[PDB]
Design a protein around this nucleic acid. Structure first.
Ligand code: AGS
Ligand code: AGS
Ligand code: AGS
Ligand code: AGS
Ligand code: ADP
Ligand code: MG
Ligand code: MG
Ligand code: MG
Ligand code: MG
Lengths: 134, 327, 402, 315, 342, 333
DNA sequence: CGCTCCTTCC
DNA sequence: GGAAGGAGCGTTTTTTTTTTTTTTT
């Protein structure tokens, strides 16, 4: 078919300013996405936070007919490996600032199948609010 | 390449600078974008006045190369039911910006074909998401639009293109592609266009195709009429004079000769005679009433298809009877 | 905080705003249905909004169920006497392991067991989603099975249907009977309505006398605030207005409370009542007393009753009943003009302004020849349906002969 | 990109709403007392129905507005399942609002809900009325089924008067320090036709496009209303004048024939200057022309013939 | 068996009236390879279907007269069942889409196209009864179906009036006029029938009356001849009364009532008779025509009354053609006629 | 197919070179043979003017037998053309990439970079379906071209008529299509008197299909007769269905002598012969208008009378009633 | 929206 | 025993396209 005038490359992540970046196991993320799908999630919240003494928090908060539910990943290296919350710069890491991204679950659930076969998942949020998943 | 495209698409304006005949609207939109105070837009107008072209050029100017992901365009050819409005448009208007390029534009082309439920659902979407989202509604028939949607959109009326704008665009087309157009041919083209640029471009393309060698041959009024098949003004004048002065047999012979020499259609002749009569001196209103009613009835009969000779004789008799009221 | 129409609810059968004749008829029918082997199995109550159908049903149940309910021998669920005189169906119940259309069935299959020692009056006021075609078919089939059932004992079944119009909505494009009117005829079918074991009693709007009496009682009950706010001396007029504005007791009480609570002076208004078919025909033919300008009346009727006036049934009724003006003794020219106008309207592809033209022509023609000394005939529903049925029979017979 | 003044200066308290002073005072008394009943607010678009309902809910609740208001709308799904689950659970929710307050369910644009949804609303209101109240907002009150109307107090909002529109426009101009004159404000009010949202939008467009507000500047952005031009065309003594109006003011300005015919019918419906028979004949001719246009002949000659027939009927 | 069918000619040579049409049919069947689509238009009862069957027999032999019937089911857009009794033969096919009302278009799209695609090398002949009753959409759909698949199928259509036929169809078909039989030919046919049936007759004039009471329709002529013969114990006398269709007598009585009583109550009473006639599935247009021409036969009325009657009849016939419900226009015609007469 | 097809189907133009009387548009269609610049086309005209044949020949010329089956999508009234079809099938075909031409077709045929969608009989499409075709016709104009064929141009919505270059197919008469009919007759060895072909064209009233069918019928009749005599005008008139001049004269005489009883009796007798009301109405119009023995006012009234009766007939009215009313009304005048 | 008839008040 | 108020009467026929909800899946 004729190539759509729309450029599919228009959506990309700016590497200069990354709000935060995370590494997670594929199995845990797939389980969390399945859990959100079961409860009929309508809106999703990606919450990321880094604090002192090696404190890492990555959570998915679902707004649905159940109300508000929370799924938080552990701090174990085997599941959640390594986290930064840069605050926008990709150079300096600060502690205490929480990055929150609000998404429609319709778009968020389109990566569950890709995550089922995943062996590793890299999450990245920029200041502009675009979520990148490798 | 673009040479393959029809002139109606090859000569599509790429920037607002190429848009002619909408100077007030163009300037208002320029000021809106320059001051960053563009409101919800409702471009209402007849076909081929430059609404889609104007909005596309505006989107190009605002964003540039990002027009792909900064603007969401929906038209009649696509599904625009209540479900589409509730999911696709809502998702597009409720998401952040790729590069903070001011706002996200939604071009609801041919929105007059949308369902009432879809418009009702879209009104509150328009109201809720306005900080970083904008709506443009293009229409040719306002009565199909709900009153609330009309009230919530700033209305811009696209008048029929003035003569000067069409002459400028014809000059640009001729300069772009080597071709000569006679002043009489240009005047006839303007008259038959009735403020439609699509007709202008189509007739120009077909008239170039009519000319044997489009290198040194100049377009003339005869070529324009032959290509379009419409009657020349002289034929209309002659047939009207015969009807209003000559006898029944002479009038019938004149009409038959006029419409058989070039195979003219009776609908075009009736329209031309109506236009000519609209600017005549009448001393009585009943004459005008008879002319208008009988001619409208005859056109309505012609629209459904019938006996051509019967309809022609009907036109002649209606004109003769109506003009008998005078004096 | 509590709304008055709920606070001032009847505590006995004598406080229900129901006419004596209708109340006696309902009592007799319900008592008959409670007999050991009752001929009637279903009580179909149909009427407008707020005519005290459910109220009178519950009040009568409170007196009847204790009389016939067989005494228990310690088999009651709880220590309480099981105060469940009325068992009602809830249309928004969503159990886990059950399809939606099967909800009502699951109710009915349970309702059969509420007999003898577990006697209870089965009331169906909150109907299932009858707008869904499959749900409506299942509901009709279940009702038919109940009527044709073969159990020695069944509990009395009462179906209260609030007859109201369905406003023309954009989300709905179908033009079925239920899409136009929500009544017993559209919800049920001919077989159920004509069943010998089903009794249908039609309720009427509450008359002005009962409304005035109950409004006066309500005002007397709340005397401190009315006297304090200086609205007592003018209460009567307000009540009168309500009495002549609506037949809905609930709406009347709500309007009275709204007027009383207002500290200033807000105009008194009540819910709008749809004009019936014969009422609309009479308005078109003989006119309206509440208005003298025909244009205003016709505009109001079209704006408020567009659904009824758009159908060809109204045009056929006008054609059928235009001759009852003076028992037919009026100039034939007027009849010819009316029929010619209706015929020419028939060619306008059912445009709304074609209906406007027809109704306005009829109104003008009847106003021209109107006089004080007029005696009218009887209004009859057009017999196009009978012609269609005869045509269908003719088609069947012709097919057989062929 | 500053927000448009239709939203930037949206009233937040009921005291800032101009027009319909009696109903607004009643709403203020309701907010003060707190005993809000089920209500239906009907009126013309853009007169302050949604704003009034939202302001009343805000004043009633305050810190509990988020947890005590369930705003549904046409853009949101409002089917029978929605009533069965979301509205039902919201009504069942037990709050701790002050003694004289109740949860508010704002069903904006309620005149578009499905029949089954309204039938379920009957039961949900019959059962959850002790702690939940419904504030329907619509344009036509009859679009709500009678069983639901029976439980709701009806408030009909009237068209805005010129004085209220002028007062609010002056307040907005003073807040924005916009330069204005008398003729410009008069033109804005005249073109508003009682719709304050339209008035604000036209004022903003005029100031942003031409700066100082003038009669000519306002007329540039906003044309004369179509219904008034149509009424002038219909009410004419000479057929020539009506034809001239139709050509210059309607046909040459880019108005479709179908729109002209529909507005002509609407105007003839509400015109009260001639006898019933004349208006009836005009409606008949308008209908014939509408028929002839719907089949494809949307030509100027058809409108001219319609005008000629109307003029003949008048004489 | 009914004498109408048991005497039906089964060959072109058997025809004894309208010899010009018989010769034209012979010419058409002379080279049955390039036969174009045919549209036979003529007054009802002339024998158009008989002529079509005779031509089909002369072309494809005698299997056409061996008719078979089948049930073909149709599913519409709304999943609605439709049943059309398909009359088929090993050499031809017959269909009456008018029985499907406004759904006839589907028959044009799903039946004719599918069979046309199938290849029989000779062609198949399809007959459409009451072509003028086809909706405009069906006629439009027929155009390219006929044009594209002329190799496989040749179409035969029959009608009593070409007015409701769209111009493209008339362009795509070869028109054949079928004049109705004259009084003499009907008299000869009836004489042969009575002679072969061993029925007694007194004078031939009776047959002429049988020809006059029908006035072109041979089917009703034979039916009423049989009715008279059986009623009179197989002895037709000169004074034997002529039996007419019941609805005809009803219409004449209604006309007499209209003439006698020009009043509103008279209109109301006539409305019931109109309802009964419509309930007998009598077409509204034929009702209007018969009422008009019964009224025009009244001796009391003068020229002006008759002219007004015919004007109103034509106007209301157009309104019936363009209208949905038929009662309005019939009642309006009657009311206007009564107003003028008064 | 040489002797097993109708003459109309066997003589369908195969190439644009043999289209007879559509030069005003055939020249434009030919000059774009090597232009790669074919625009969207709207052919409109009366029945049997050579619209489908023209587009089929154009497609054959540009693509050829092998490539035609892939670059052409044809839809007509017989096909179901609902709004959903327009949205899905037409859009999908328009958005498709043009199939790669082979070596042979490129060597021998232009093979333009665009395909064709032919919506024959577009006047039968609903307004909404026509609206759904507006932007599709424009978005994919670089790889697709549209052709809409119709008899009633007014039935096409204004936006589509604006989006398409309009070609009017003129009526074919004895001065435009005599050559084609003469060629067909010569190839079919059909014999006729001088002016017979002109009479057939005049009877056709601007429809070469009707003329060809009438010529085929006349040839069949002549062959069956087997007399070796040229076909005369009488035979073509009789097979065409034209009322004989004698019947017209008798009708005129009855009308002139105003008498309702006599007129209605004669009308009943005439209509019991199977004649068509349209033909007799046309003949009466010709006779009355062309006659110089009548006053101007009578012609003015009779023109409107004939127009009204013809309009009534086109609506599908009873021919008997309409003819009787027309005759009575002319008698009154 | 009237007719007709039945209840009730007075 | 007029006078007013009120009840009962007076009612049921399909079917083009398209969109949309509902339910099941
Ligand atoms: N102002 C203009 N200046 C130059 N060319 C124009 C102008 N308006 C229209 N055209 C030409 O005509 C074509 C019409 O394009 P559109 O902008 O879609 O017309 P339109 O006003 O949208 O008609 P509708 O309402 O969609 S049918 C353009 O692609 C140009 O080729
Ligand atoms: N005196 C009274 N008589 C009857 N109902 C009363 C009275 N006073 C208050 N009401 C209330 O008014 C309301 C109307 O009565 P309902 O019987 O519920 O109406 P309805 O006949 O059921 O109409 P629907 O279908 O419920 S809208 C009920 O909530 C009653 O409790
Ligand atoms: N009475 C009023 N006083 C002051 N501002 C008003 C008034 N009415 C409308 N406005 C302004 O117009 C804006 C839109 O008003 P809304 O109340 O949303 O319209 P509306 O009356 O609800 O019409 P609908 O129902 O949404 S179509 C408000 O945000 C105000 O800025
Ligand atoms: N210009 C022409 N030159 C030669 N033969 C023609 C011409 N026009 C029509 N014909 C003949 O008549 C037949 C008519 O075919 P079409 O081209 O489909 O007619 P048409 O213009 O499509 O009529 P409509 O509009 O579909 S009813 C052709 O197959 C030819 O046999
Ligand atoms: N030429 C004929 N000779 C004898 N009988 C005929 C002839 N033509 C028709 N009929 C008779 O007329 C009857 C009805 O004819 P029919 O086929 O119904 O005509 P149409 O097709 O015009 O309605 C047939 O039963 C047939 O017996
Ligand atoms: Mg556009
Ligand atoms: Mg109740
Ligand atoms: Mg609102
Ligand atoms: Mg064709």
């Amino acid at each position: 078919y004729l190539i759509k005038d729309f450029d599919t490359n228009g959506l990309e992540l700016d590497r200069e300013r990354i709000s935060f970046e995370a590494i997670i196991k594929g199995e845990a993320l797939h389980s969390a996405l399945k859990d959100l799908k079961e409860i009929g999630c309508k809106e999703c919240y990606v919450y990321a936070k880094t604090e002192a003494n090696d404190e890492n928090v990555f959570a998915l908060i679902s707004k649905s007919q159940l109300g508000f539910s929370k799924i938080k990943l552990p701090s174990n290296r085997s599941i959640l490996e390594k986290l930064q919350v840069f605050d926008g710069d990709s150079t300096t890491v600060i502690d205490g600032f929480a990055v929150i991204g609000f998404f429609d679950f319709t778009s968020f659930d389109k990566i569950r199948k890709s995550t089922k076969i995943a062996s590793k998942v890299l999450f990245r949020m920029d200041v502009h609010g675009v979520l990148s998943v490798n | 390449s673009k040479e393959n495209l029809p002139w109606v698409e090859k000569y599509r304006p790429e920037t607002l600078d190429e848009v002619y005949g909408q100077n007030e609207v163009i300037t208002t939109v320029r000021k809106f974008v320059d001051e960053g105070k563009l409101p919800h837009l409702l471009f209402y107008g007849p076909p081929g006045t430059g609404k889609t072209s104007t909005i596309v050029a505006l989107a190009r100017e605002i964003y540039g190369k990002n027009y792909s992901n900064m603007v969401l365009e929906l038209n009649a050819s696509d599904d625009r039911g209540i479900d589409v409005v509730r999911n696709q448009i809502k998702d597009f208007a409720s998401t952040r910006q790729i590069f903070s390029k001011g706002f996200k534009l939604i071009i609801l082309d041919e929105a007059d074909a949308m369902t009432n439920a879809a418009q009702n659902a879209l009104r509150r979407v328009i109201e809720r998401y306005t900080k970083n989202t904008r709506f443009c509604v293009l229409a040719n028939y306002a009565h199909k639009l709900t009153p609330a949607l009309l009230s919530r959109c700033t209305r811009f009326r696209f008048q029929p293109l003035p003569q000067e704008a069409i002459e400028r665009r014809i000059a640009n087309v001729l300069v772009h592609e080597k071709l000569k157009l006679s002043p009489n041919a240009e005047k006839a083209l303007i008259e038959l266009s009735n403020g439609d640029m699509r007709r202008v471009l189509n007739v120009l393309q077909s008239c170039k195709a009519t000319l044997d060698n489009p290198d040194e041959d100049e377009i003339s009024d005869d070529v324009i009429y032959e290509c379009c098949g419409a009657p020349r003004p002289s034929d209309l004048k002659a047939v009207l004079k015969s009807i209003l002065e000559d006898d029944w047999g002479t009038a019938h012979y004149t009409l038959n000769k006029v419409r058989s020499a070039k195979g003219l259609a009776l609908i075009d002749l009736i329209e031309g005679i109506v236009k000519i009569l609209e600017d005549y001196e009448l001393q009585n209103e009943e004459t005008r009433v008879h002319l208008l009613t009988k001619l409208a009835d005859i056109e309505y009969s012609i629209s459904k298809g019938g006996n051509d000779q019967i309809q022609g004789s009907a036109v002649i008799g209606a004109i003769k009877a109506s003009f008998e009221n005078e004096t | 905080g509590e709304q008055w129409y709920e606070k001032f609810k009847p505590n006995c059968l004598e406080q229900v705003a129901i006419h004596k004749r209708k109340l006696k008829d309902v009592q007799e029918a319900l008592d008959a249905m409670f007999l050991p082997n009752a001929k009637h199995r279903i009580l179909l109550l149909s009427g407008p909004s707020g005519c005290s159908k459910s109220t009178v049903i519950k009040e009568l149940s409170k007196i009847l169920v204790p009389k016939y309910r067989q005494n228990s021998n310690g088999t009651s669920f709880r220590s309480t006497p099981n105060e469940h005189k009325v068992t009602e169906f809830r249309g928004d119940c969503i159990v886990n392991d059950l399809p939606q259309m099967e909800s009502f069935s699951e109710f009915l299959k349970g309702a059969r067991y509420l007999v003898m020692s577990n006697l209870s009056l089965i009331l169906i006021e909150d109907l299932p989603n009858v707008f869904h075609i499959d749900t409506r078919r299942r509901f009709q089939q279940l009702i038919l099975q109940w009527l044709y059932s073969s159990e020695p004992l069944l509990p009395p079944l009462v179906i209260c249907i609030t007859e109201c119009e369905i406003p023309e909505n954009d989300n709905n494009y179908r033009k079925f009977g239920i899409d136009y009117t929500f009544s017993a005829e559209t919800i049920m079918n001919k077989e159920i309505l004509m069943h010998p074991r089903l009794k249908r009693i039609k309720f009427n709007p509450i008359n002005s006398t009962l409304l005035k009496k109950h409004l006066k009682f309500i005002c007397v009950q709340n005397m401190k605030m009315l006297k304090e706010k200086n609205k007592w001396n003018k209460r009567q007029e307000v009540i009168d207005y309500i009495a002549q504005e609506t037949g809905d007791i609930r709406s009347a009480i709500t309007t009275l409370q709204f007027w009383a609570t207002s500290s200033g002076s807000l105009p008194i208004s009540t819910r709008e009542s749809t004009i019936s078919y014969f009422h609309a025909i009479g308005k078109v033919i003989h006119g309206s007393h509440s208005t003298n300008n025909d244009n205003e009346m016709i505009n109001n009727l079209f704006e408020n009753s567009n659904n009824l006036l758009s159908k060809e049934d109204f045009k056929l009724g006008i054609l059928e009943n235009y001759n009852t003006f003076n028992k037919g003794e009026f100039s034939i020219s007027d009849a010819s003009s009316i029929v010619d106008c209706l015929s020419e309207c028939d060619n306008m592809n059912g445009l709304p302004e074609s209906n406007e033209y027809g109704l306005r022509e009829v109104r003008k023609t009847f106003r021209n020849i109107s006089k004080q000394g007029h005696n009218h005939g009887t209004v009859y529903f057009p017999r196009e349906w009978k012609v269609r049925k005869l045509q269908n029979s003719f088609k069947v017979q012709a097919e057989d002969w062929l | 990109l500053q927000l448009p003044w239709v939203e930037k200066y949206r009233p937040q308290v009921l005291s800032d709403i101009v027009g319909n002073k009696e109903t607004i005072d009643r709403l203020q008394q309701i907010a003060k007392d707190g005993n809000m009943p089920h209500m239906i607010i009907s009126g013309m678009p853009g007169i302050g129905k949604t704003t009034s309902v939202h302001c009343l809910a805000h004043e009633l609740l305050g810190r509990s507005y988020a947890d005590g208001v369930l705003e549904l709308n046409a853009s949101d799904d409002r089917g029978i399942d929605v009533v069965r689950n979301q509205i039902k659970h919201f009504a069942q929710k037990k709050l701790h609002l002050p003694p004289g307050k109740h949860k508010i369910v704002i069903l904006d644009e309620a005149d578009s809900m499905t029949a089954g949804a309204q039938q379920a609303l009957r039961r949900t209101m019959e059962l959850y009325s002790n702690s939940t109240r419904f504030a329907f907002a619509c344009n036509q009150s009859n679009k709500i089924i009678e069983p639901l109307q029976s439980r709701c107090a009806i408030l009909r909002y009237s068209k805005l008067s010129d004085e209220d529109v002028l007062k609010r426009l002056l307040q907005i101009i003073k807040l924005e320090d916009v330069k204005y004159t008398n003729d410009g404000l008069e033109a804005i009010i005249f073109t508003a036709e009682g719709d304050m949202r339209q008035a604000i939008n036209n004022l903003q467009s005029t100031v942003a496009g031409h700066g100082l507000v003038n009669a000519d500047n306002v007329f540039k952005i906003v044309d004369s209303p179509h219904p008034l031009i149509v009424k002038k065309m219909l009410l004419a003594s000479n057929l020539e004048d009506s034809i001239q109006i139709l050509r210059t003011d309607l046909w040459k300005k880019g108005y479709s024939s179908i729109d002209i015919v529909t507005t002509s019918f609407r105007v003839t419906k509400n015109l009260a200057q001639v006898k019933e028979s004349v208006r009836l004949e005009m409606i008949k001719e308008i209908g014939l022309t509408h028929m002839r246009i719907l089949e494809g002949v949307g030509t100027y000659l058809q409108l001219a013939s319609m005008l000629a027939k109307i003029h003949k009927l008048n004489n | 068996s009914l004498w109408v069918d048991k005497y039906r000619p089964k060959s072109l040579n058997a025809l004894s009236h309208n010899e010009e049409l018989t010769n034209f049919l012979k010419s058409l069947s002379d080279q049955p390879r390039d036969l174009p689509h045919l549209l036979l238009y003529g007054p009802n009862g002339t024998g158009k279907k008989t002529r079509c069957m005779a031509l089909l027999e002369s072309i494809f032999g005698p299997g056409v007269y061996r008719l078979k019937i089948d049930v073909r089911q149709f599913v519409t857009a709304s999943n609605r069942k439709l049943e059309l009794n398909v009359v088929s033969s090993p050499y031809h096919l017959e269909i009456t889409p008018s029985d499907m009302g406004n759904n006839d278009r589907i028959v044009i799209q799903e039946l004719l196209k599918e069979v046309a695609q199938m290849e029989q090398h000779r062609y198949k002949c399809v007959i459409i009864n009451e072509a003028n009753s086809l909706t405009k959409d069906a006629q439009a759909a027929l155009r390219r179906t006929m044009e594209k698949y002329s190799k496989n199928i040749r179409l035969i259509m029959v009608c009593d009036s070409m007015s409701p036929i769209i111009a493209p169809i008339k362009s795509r078909c070869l028109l054949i006029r079928c004049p109705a039989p004259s009084d003499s030919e009907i008299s000869t046919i009836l004489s042969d029938v009575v002679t072969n049936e061993r029925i007694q007759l007194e004078t031939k004039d009776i047959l002429k009356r049988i020809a006059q009471a029908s006035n072109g329709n041979l089917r009703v002529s034979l039916l009423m001849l049989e009715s008279m013969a059986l009623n009179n114990e197989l002895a037709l006398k000169s004074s034997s009364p002529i039996i007419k269709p019941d609805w005809i007598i009803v219409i004449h009585k209604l006309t007499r009532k209209i003439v006698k009583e020009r009043s509103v109550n008279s209109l109301i009473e006539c409305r019931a008779v109109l309802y009964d006639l419509l309930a007998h599935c009598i077409p509204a247009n034929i009702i209007l025509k018969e009422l008009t021409f019964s009224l025009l036969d009244v001796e009391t009325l003068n020229t002006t009354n008759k002219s007004s009657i015919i004007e109103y009849s034509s106007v209301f016939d157009e309104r019936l053609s363009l209208g949905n419900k038929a009662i309005f226009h019939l009642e309006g015609f009657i009311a206007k006629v009564m107003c003028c007469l008064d | 197919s040489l002797a097993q097809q109708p003459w109309v189907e066997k003589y369908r133009p195969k190439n644009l070179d043999e289209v007879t009387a559509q030069d005003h548009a055939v020249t434009v269609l030919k000059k774009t043979l090597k232009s790669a610049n074919l625009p969207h086309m709207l052919f409109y005209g009366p029945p049997g003017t050579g619209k489908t044949s023209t587009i089929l020949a154009l497609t054959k010329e540009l693509y050829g037998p092998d490539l035609m089956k892939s670059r052409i999508l044809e839809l007509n009234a017989s096909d179901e053309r609902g709004i959903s079809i327009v949205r899905e099938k037409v859009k999908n075909f328009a958005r498709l990439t043009v199939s790669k031409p082979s070596k042979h077709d490129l060597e021998n045929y232009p093979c333009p970079p665009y395909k064709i969608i032919i919506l024959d009989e577009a006047d039968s499409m609903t307004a909404d379906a026509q609206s759904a075709l507006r932007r599709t016709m424009e978005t994919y104009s670089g790889v697709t071209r549209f052709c809409l064929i119709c008899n009633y141009v007014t039935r096409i919505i204004d936006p589509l008529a604006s989006r398409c270059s309009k070609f009017r197919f003129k009526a074919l008469d004895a001065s435009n299509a005599i050559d084609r009919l003469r060629f067909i007759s010569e190839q079919e060895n059909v014999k006729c008197d001088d002016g017979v072909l002109e009479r057939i064209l005049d009877i056709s009233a601007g429809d070469l299909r009707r003329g060809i069918t009438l010529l085929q019928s006349a040839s069949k009749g002549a062959q069956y007769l087997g007399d070796g005599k040229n076909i005369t005008s009488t035979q073509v008139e009789e097979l065409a269905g034209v009322v004989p001049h004698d019947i017209l004269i008798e009708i005129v005489e009855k009308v002139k002598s105003g008498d309702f009883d006599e007129i209605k009796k004669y009308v009943n007798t005439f209509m019991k012969s199977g004649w068509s009301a349209a033909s007799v109405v046309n003949q009466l119009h010709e006779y009355y208008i062309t006659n110089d023995n009548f006053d101007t006012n009578f012609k003015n009234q009779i023109s409107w009378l004939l127009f009204t009766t013809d309009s009534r007939l086109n609506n599908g009215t009873n021919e008997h009633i309409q003819l009787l009313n027309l005759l009575v009304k002319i008698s009154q005048l």
